[PDB]
């Protein structure tokens, strides 16, 4: 059909803002609305990644999951010109993202919210008093490790200050710093983990995960015991051995039914949410590549 | 005397009427007329195989603004689509002449394992019988007839024993899809396949290739399980399994639904799972993973199965064929 | 240009190169000297032989 949007800007653009902008003439962008006439508002992620309010990872994933993505194609001060990304077609995307990861033919690119420093994901347009923020695009296997390692870095870095003698930060850094993949080694730039809670964009997700893991074994056994009938899964009775002696010791009588069901329900909510998160909802396949051209045929 | 104040209907009616025409469908035929031209117009699919001359290029219309060639090469308006027609995307493979047997069936889909050498320029692909070769009167005879000296394959992945014990063999391997064209050379063969689209032949002489799987591996999930309706699409899967014999590769096909398919899988594997996990070896951490599944695409149902007997070196092989398959590869899912 | 091949090798599409060459500028100087007595008697009409 026709797929294109021209976004007008308020004022003209300063020079070193135009060249800086040109440097990303092949990357992806999260839109606001599906119309061929839009302001600059709702085009990056600062709409949900501003500097005033605290960044929430989950708040950004809940927006990337349900939005429209597009590719830049022309940038010339007075207006930008992009093209939507709707299924049923093949687009051509040019890899340029400051923390750089070498792509391979026949992979599956995953758009993940920026976890690295802000300057490697954002571009400011001060002529218009607007920052545009770009989502991070990694090959699915890589993101699979980069999201677990950073999250465990959060945990360790918090608990070591909470309790000194639990571990050594040096065991944390040399372990989690490097991520290696497919005959390639990559070195993470870690976010230095500021102390107080809530001001870590991973703090919320770490809370979700840890509360889930603290609540799991209490409800697991109860759910196991209640199930058994004359006719049930053989495999259930089988795995009923696997659980440690410790958990099978827990007595359901001690917990009150109100609190018990509270744990049950909140834990199930946390599971249903968290497991969905890991799937890396916006994911797109790769068919071809060029290392010298930085071109990937994706869809 | 009114000084023009905007774009006018001219240059607008032209653009819009050409943008306008909708596809024809539901033409009425009368047994009196019984045949017409517009009937043919509805009929023709407009295949694109242009034949190398300048004027013929345009006549075929392979030179057309739309990704699909349109009639006459963009002169007419068109129908802005063809029932969601997406030209199949193709994958170009360069395979060592030893790993792949040229006499293989063309319908057979392919699998490539991820090699981990710096800047790998030659890759190693695997077909079902080949994977059966690696992981070690039935298949075995026909396989050993097709592939000899399995070390010629085993040296491709110098990590096989490590991955089978590490239960990570499933995650590396990516399927691609069915075979399309084949050129045979002494050193490195030229092979090309298709991913994410209708399975089709690219040869100038037209041929309709149908995906094939040998009968020992393929297991119809809906066959052995038995109101229920029959929908249009029927989906095919691969499943990898680490049994105490070894990694054992099979197949699965049904329309029953994903959440349902994972469940039927458990009841299917349960007795095998029991002895696998039983007294023989208790278990560590990584070892717990047992198998993995993937979705292989859509195949119109009620078409069902024919069984084609493949011939090689004076021996018969029983093989099932599924027609008009549409390639759509999905990722891997643990089953336990 | 390119060549057609039988292998499945990734095909190089149409290519094209653009190169720019620029100029260089060069300077030359010299100095000569003359006395004032010499330059002055170029101005005056001579009286005697």
XYZ file of C-alpha atoms in Angstrom, chain B residues 92 94 183 190, chain C residues 6-9:
8
model
C 21.493 -19.889 -0.010
C 27.189 -23.772 0.695
C 24.169 -28.214 -7.931
C 25.667 -25.500 -4.077
C 27.017 -21.740 -10.204
C 27.709 -21.974 -6.490
C 25.218 -20.631 -4.002
C 27.674 -17.908 -3.004
